[PDB]
């Protein structure tokens with residue numbers, strides 16, 4: 001089947017890239033960052 005995670009709690013703000021939901025905008029505003037771009041990785045596995 002194609003069931004999904006039963007999310008609980010409605011949020012006023014919701015991302016536009018993924019569609020997430022944050023109680024406080026500030027929180028989301030910082031989330032969108034992941035959609036814009038973020039450099040974390042670096043060293044190659046070995």
Ligand SMILES: [Zn+2]
Nearest residue numbers: 015017018019
């Ligand atoms: Zn998002």
